[PDB]
């Protein structure tokens, strides 16, 4: 039974997250809520429904909350952010960092984790505050769970980047595999409705992180990418 560690936010983290639900794995969400709630919450849905108010510390609340919700696994968790741009600490964050302790039961989950997954969010907002403070950020580090990115869709912050610069900004902040969408968003769709972030294969391989292509692209799946998730924790030696 996978033990999946995921670290993200956005949109996307419920569409992902709702997906491990129907799947058979221990989830684990380091978030800092609701739709993380609602997705991983096993109420049935007229109640979910109702879930939306939003006028139900955070870290007790939620795991008070998250047993209230019926949730088999668990959402852990002030603290403020910093950015240090490419100039003046509208711009490009070059480095954002967070200022402190994180708490002893998430390393414990990262640490016995299988999979430890990182976005759908984006990089300096969500999957970066969370990584940044360092003990949290050593686990992901020292862990025999393999670490997993599903890079953003598309692109102040992340301007003209591609797979590679992703990867590359968060190591830098301290990556196995990459979960890369090939699939290409339209012009008039867009315009209908900032760019889609490039694939540099080499400059991603050059990393030391492998690469997996496909369609994660739905107009990410959730369900697709949950399929590459859970085939890599499969076959991966640290299951096994």
Not at 111 to 128: E, H, K, N, R, W
Not at 177 to 189: A, C, R
Request: glycine letters at 8%; one cysteine or more.
């Amino acid at each position: 039974r996978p033990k999946i560690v995921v670290i993200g936010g956005g949109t996307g983290l419920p569409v992902v997250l709702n997906g491990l639900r129907k799947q058979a794995v221990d989830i684990t969400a380091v978030v800092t809520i609701r739709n993380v709630m609602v997705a991983l919450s096993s109420w049935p849905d007229l109640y979910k429904d109702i879930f939306q108010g939003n006028l139900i510390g955070v870290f007790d609340a939620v795991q008070e909350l998250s047993n209230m919700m019926q949730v088999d696994g668990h959402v852990y968790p002030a603290l403020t952010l910093h950015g240090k741009f490419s100039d003046g600490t509208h711009k490009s964050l070059e480095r954002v960092w967070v200022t402190p302790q994180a708490v002893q039961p998430v390393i414990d989950a990262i640490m016995a984790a299988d999979q430890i997954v990182l976005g759908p969010g984006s990089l300096f907002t969500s999957i970066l505050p969370n990584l940044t403070i360092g003990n949290i950020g050593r686990a992901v580090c020292e862990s025999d769970a393999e670490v997993v990115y599903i890079c953003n869709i598309m692109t102040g912050e992340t301007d003209n980047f591609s797979d590679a610069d992703h990867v590359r900004v968060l190591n830098r902040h301290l990556i196995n595999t990459v979960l890369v969408n090939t699939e290409k968003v339209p012009e008039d769709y867009m315009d209908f409705h900032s760019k889609q972030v490039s694939h540099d294969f080499r400059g991603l391989r050059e990393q030391n992180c492998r690469v997996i292509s496909s369609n994660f692209l739905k107009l990410h799946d959730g369900d697709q990418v949950v399929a590459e998730l859970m085939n890599l924790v499969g076959h991966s030696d640290v299951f096994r």
